[PDB]
Design a protein around this nucleic acid. Sequence first.
RNA 1: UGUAACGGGGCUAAACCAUGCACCGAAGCUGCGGCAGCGACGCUUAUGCGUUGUUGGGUAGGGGAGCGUUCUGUAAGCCUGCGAAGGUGUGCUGUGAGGCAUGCUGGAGGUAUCAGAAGUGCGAAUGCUGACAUAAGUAACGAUAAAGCGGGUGAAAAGCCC
RNA 2: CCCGGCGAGGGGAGUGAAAAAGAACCUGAAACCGUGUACGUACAAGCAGUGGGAGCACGCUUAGGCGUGUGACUGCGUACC
Lengths: 110, 103, 150, 56, 48, 27, 142, 117
Amino acid sequence: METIAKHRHARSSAQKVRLVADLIRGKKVSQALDILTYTNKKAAVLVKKVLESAIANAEHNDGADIDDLKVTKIFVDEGPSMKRIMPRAKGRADRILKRTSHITVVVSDR
Amino acid sequence: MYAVFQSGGKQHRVSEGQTVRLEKLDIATGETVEFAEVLMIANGEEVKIGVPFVDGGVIKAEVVAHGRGEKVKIVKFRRRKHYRKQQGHRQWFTDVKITGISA
Amino acid sequence: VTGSGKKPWRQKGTGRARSGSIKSPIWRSGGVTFAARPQDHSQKVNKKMYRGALKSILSELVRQDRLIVVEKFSVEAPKTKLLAQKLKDMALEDVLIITGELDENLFLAARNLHKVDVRDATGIDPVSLIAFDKVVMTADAVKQVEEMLA
Amino acid sequence: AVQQNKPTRSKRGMRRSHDALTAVTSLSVDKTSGEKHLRHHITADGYYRGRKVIAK
Amino acid sequence: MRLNTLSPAEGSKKAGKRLGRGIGSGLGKTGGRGHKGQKSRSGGGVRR
Amino acid sequence: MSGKMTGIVKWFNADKGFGFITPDDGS
Amino acid sequence: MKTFTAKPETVKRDWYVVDATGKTLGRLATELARRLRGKHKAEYTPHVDTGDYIIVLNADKVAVTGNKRTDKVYYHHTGHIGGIKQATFEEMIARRPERVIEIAVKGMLPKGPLGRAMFRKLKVYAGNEHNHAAQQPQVLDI
Amino acid sequence: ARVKRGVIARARHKKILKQAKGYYGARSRVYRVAFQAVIKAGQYAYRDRRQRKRQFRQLWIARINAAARQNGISYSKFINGLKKASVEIDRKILADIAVFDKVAFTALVEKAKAALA
RNA sequence: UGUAACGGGGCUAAACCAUGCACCGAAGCUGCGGCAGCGACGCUUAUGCGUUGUUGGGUAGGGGAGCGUUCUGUAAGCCUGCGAAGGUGUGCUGUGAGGCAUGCUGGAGGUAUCAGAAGUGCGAAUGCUGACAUAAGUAACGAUAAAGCGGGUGAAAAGCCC
RNA sequence: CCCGGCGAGGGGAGUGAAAAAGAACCUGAAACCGUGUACGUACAAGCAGUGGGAGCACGCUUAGGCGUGUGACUGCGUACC
Ligand SMILES: [Mg+2]
Ligand SMILES: [Mg+2]
Ligand SMILES: [Mg+2]
Ligand SMILES: [Mg+2]
Ligand SMILES: [Mg+2]
Ligand SMILES: [Mg+2]
Ligand SMILES: [Mg+2]
Ligand SMILES: [Mg+2]
Ligand SMILES: [Mg+2]
Ligand SMILES: [Mg+2]
Ligand SMILES: [Mg+2]
Ligand SMILES: [Mg+2]
Ligand SMILES: [Mg+2]
Ligand SMILES: [Mg+2]
Ligand SMILES: [Mg+2]
Ligand SMILES: [Mg+2]
Ligand SMILES: [Mg+2]
Ligand SMILES: [Mg+2]
Ligand SMILES: [Mg+2]
Ligand SMILES: [Mg+2]
Ligand SMILES: [Mg+2]
Ligand SMILES: [Mg+2]
Ligand SMILES: [Mg+2]
Ligand SMILES: [Mg+2]
Ligand SMILES: [Mg+2]
Ligand SMILES: [Mg+2]
Ligand SMILES: [Mg+2]
Ligand SMILES: [Mg+2]
Ligand SMILES: [Mg+2]
Ligand SMILES: [Mg+2]
Ligand SMILES: [Mg+2]
Ligand SMILES: [Mg+2]
Ligand SMILES: [Mg+2]
Ligand SMILES: [Mg+2]
Ligand SMILES: [Mg+2]
Ligand SMILES: [Mg+2]
Ligand SMILES: [Mg+2]
Ligand SMILES: [Mg+2]
Ligand SMILES: [Mg+2]
Ligand SMILES: [Mg+2]
Ligand SMILES: [Mg+2]
Ligand SMILES: [Mg+2]
Ligand SMILES: [Mg+2]
């Protein structure tokens, strides 16, 4: 029984988050939570809070025991990019991109 | 046993019970053709070579179906000279099935 | 186009394309290149060609049996129910009714039916004579059509 | 000092071929509190190699 | 004889040139104008 | 200030009259 | 029908031993490259290695005509900027004589991965003996 | 009026981009590159319909030359033998017989040798 | 810059001279099939029906014939919630521009035919506008006046407070 | 109702014909970026294809063998305006 959790508009780059998300693909959730506990990236705080939400949704909304659960699908999509103007020298302006993400964690038994 | 015969300007090695795609013939879709100009008949170390053609040999085949081949696209393009063409082509054929090699 | 006739940027030096006007028809919200004017689409038709066409298509409605000639076609009271009864008795649905007179009760009883049109003998046209399935002529309107058309 | 062709996403992935993170191999377990920690680091509660080195 | 049965005479309506709509039309990029002249220019041509 | 933001391209090329780092003018 | 093509799994290859004593170099080498290519077989196929394994012995006793024994020059380049090198025929024979046959066949073979696979079957030896008796090689006479 | 041309230009790009499947990179994704690549594929296809007839004749000839020299006669002697014996068998069939029926190819060689002798 | 003045390997012929017979070799020619143009001839033309020759590389450019789009009439007709347009696939078909059918999405319009009118077809114009890449998770994070610790608050403290 | 910071965001439940109508809201193409599956790829040189073509996987099938995807190797081949 699959259980989905999403953190849409994650204020972070998708490239920076996919480094963390590739560590726990296919893992047991007790191992993934220990990896995210002792991973020093900010995306580990995000994707840990999402994995905890997916676990609690699987236990409450779907009736599933936590020890048999396993992270079958996890993927990070590019979100909307809010855009700012940064001034440079000699009157030149640059438009920086402030990337967002859509974190998605699907957790299941099978 | 195999045999070799000319049809449509080209030659065909063929045994009995074979289906052979030929160039378009003027024969209805169920009739029987007979290829008299046979070039070689082999029957398991019982070959005969037509010096100009095998004399007594004839191939009796039944026309299964006519049809058109797969579409091909002809593209001509002269670069930087403002010229290109397109042209399709499908070639008529005729599948036959060999009823029997009368040696 | 509402705007100003000032170059959006200088001619050279910048890396951008040359531009002279913001009203240019290659810009967004620029002008139309060949913007249209109010024009008259009316064509000249010669008089003998107009009458040759009418004499042709009245000959064709005769040959196609799409022309019905009666002596009189009147409605007592201006009622579309009376007109629909009379046309149902005539077995007609899509019809042009040309009358050599001015019948007001007939105009009013035919004004609401889109299947039916009622003309004066002067006000006949070839496109109506074709667009309607049957054409009913008063014999006086025949005499007038033959007189106009020689 | 700048490129002349757009580099492909294949070369981009090949450049990112080495940018993968190495997960922690195994978490050491305290012998007293039974909780997990980094090897040679104190626990979150303040244990290290068994003893409570600092209250909290 | 209806409005969807009429058709004009043969050779009455001629199609008309449409310059600058592809190679196959014949009237390609230049449209009967050649290359780099005064005649090829917009409004170009000499007086009588 | 979405006005200034809409129009930035107009002026990031603000002064653009400066260059000529070729003292040997090629003359 | 369609023209037959050889298949690399069903193709059979054989082993041959050639003694290269006294034979002319290039006239030997083109027959070796013919049989590594497989152009002596009716099931020849250009994109398939159909040739035979060949053991060449007495490579140091190969013969050339004329003064080419003292005048044929093998240039090569090391990659470095002065790195043009040079060796004559009898110097290559004294130093490493197998290269002479190897170079001649490499020049007569196709260029590519298949030509390198054809070259992998050529097994030359300066002496008159080989360790490949286990493959039951036949005596090829050229 | 005012023909809006989004539908036509979309279907026109998708007709090319369907033909450009399998190509590397932007050649399968981008119309400016794909159209430039499809035309080259049509040029190559027109060319290699001519080159197919060369390459198979060359393959057939090399297979006939191998099987004839296996039976102890060259190609150029063998074709001249079949000309002098009037045998009008084309060299597709000769390569097929040289592969599958080596006995019949041997009999053809002996006919050609007897036509020269 | 390196063999570097046979294309290379290599060749004492695998070089040259003479003669000869073979063979390879082009989109040339021939074979088979298919399309079209222009001429013949005849039909008894329906202005095209056999046969017949011959032609068919092509820029600028000239001539001829078409596809498709939006809109108007035909159309208060026809199709359509038993699913329109549009989007995305597949199969078939035509010499081509293209066409038809249908699966999924979609959830309400579309339109034959024959004519008519065009803001009628885009890859380029250092084209215009919007979106998204790239370099790249690189440079940089704005004076080299300087920070360290305890405690607090707090989901969380190098930066806040004491 | 649950996780979460009395968050953001999401999962349910519920409304509704429909939530792949949830307010960043009709239909939602492409560029671009991802996850999964099949095949191929770490001795191999160039407009990246085409002609040939082994093998592998998958469907159909009366085994007839065809399709489909991939494409080892190989002949030819220096983009467009
Ligand atoms: Mg300033
Ligand atoms: Mg002024
Ligand atoms: Mg505006
Ligand atoms: Mg305007
Ligand atoms: Mg007047
Ligand atoms: Mg460049
Ligand atoms: Mg890196
Ligand atoms: Mg020009
Ligand atoms: Mg000039
Ligand atoms: Mg001129
Ligand atoms: Mg080559
Ligand atoms: Mg694609
Ligand atoms: Mg030198
Ligand atoms: Mg040829
Ligand atoms: Mg020809
Ligand atoms: Mg012909
Ligand atoms: Mg010609
Ligand atoms: Mg021409
Ligand atoms: Mg022209
Ligand atoms: Mg309309
Ligand atoms: Mg539906
Ligand atoms: Mg519309
Ligand atoms: Mg559609
Ligand atoms: Mg639809
Ligand atoms: Mg336009
Ligand atoms: Mg465009
Ligand atoms: Mg162009
Ligand atoms: Mg542009
Ligand atoms: Mg980057
Ligand atoms: Mg950094
Ligand atoms: Mg760098
Ligand atoms: Mg650096
Ligand atoms: Mg730095
Ligand atoms: Mg600072
Ligand atoms: Mg502190
Ligand atoms: Mg500070
Ligand atoms: Mg909420
Ligand atoms: Mg709606
Ligand atoms: Mg939407
Ligand atoms: Mg898309
Ligand atoms: Mg390998
Ligand atoms: Mg490379
Ligand atoms: Mg192919």
